[PDB]
Write a protein that binds this ligand. Structure first.
Ligand SMILES: CC(C)NC(=O)Nc1ccccc1
Ligand SMILES: [Mg+2]
Lengths: 150, 150
């Protein structure tokens, strides 16, 4: 159906952008709003309300640019805003070598049902935060399964 | 009115982005649609349909990124698409040292009433193409006045 084709197109756009950033070890933080509304965090960023594309996602996260500092938040199949604030987790159970990008992803996942994708700037490793937990060292197959499950 | 305030915000966003890119010698090609519809050219690019911001305009044009090659086309207060094709002018009044961005800008200006801004990656100079003419080496003040008058 139209809705299904649109969801698959967005999943493909995300995975392509994530693959590009993982290869180049470009740090990234991408939160997908679900049932819990995140308007209050969207409002902290730069409004975009833009169509999703792998190209736009990549251009947002390029290091040392206006938009790369903070989270992209997606809502209703669009990029709602970039450079958004997310709350930092105080969980003592996050791997100690990880920094604020991952703690922000876990933090928003503690108070929403959202799914957040993180690319490490140190390793290019890809992880997902959901329900207060961080799922690390994901393959492409694993991230896709997570997006389809979501 | 709200229409006039939105226009002023878009002009402020455009001028801030152009000023930033000029200082850094970031090549840019930005066409503002007017009364002649540019749908045929918009459809050649990557759709964004995004709210304008100086930050997004800058991020689009960062060298060696997916979106930087080709024109950004704006429709009113939105970035409609990036990496768009524009036709190349054959006018003999284009300085011979100028490259394809300037020739594309004059080209679209010959078949539309649009206003196109170009930042040279060679010199950082700012120019505008309108009605088949290229006006070069604009001050910040002159550009803003041209946009306000448009
Ligand atoms: C060089 C690596 C880091 N290449 C990848 O493509 N990794 C990756 C990990 C999770 C999801 C998608 C891609
Ligand atoms: Mg002059």
């Amino acid at each position: 159906t139209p809705v299904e084709e649109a969801q698959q197109k967005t999943i493909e756009a995300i995975t392509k952008a994530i693959n590009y950033m993982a290869k180049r070890r470009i740090g990234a933080l991408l939160t997908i709003e679900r049932d819990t509304g995140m308007g209050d965090y969207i409002e902290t960023g730069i409004p975009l309300n833009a169509k999703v594309s792998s190209e736009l996602l990549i251009n947002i996260f390029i290091p040392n640019t206006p938009l790369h500092d903070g989270a992209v938040i997606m809502k209703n199949n669009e990029i709602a805003a970039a450079a958004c604030y997310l709350p930092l987790s105080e969980s003592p159970f996050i791997s100690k070598e990880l920094g604020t990008r991952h703690r922000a992803a876990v933090g928003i996942s503690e108070v929403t049902d959202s799914l957040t994708i993180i690319v490490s700037e140190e390793t290019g490793g890809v992880s997902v935060a959901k329900n207060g937990d961080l799922h690390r060292e994901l393959t492409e197959e694993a991230l896709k399964e997570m997006l389809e499950a979501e």
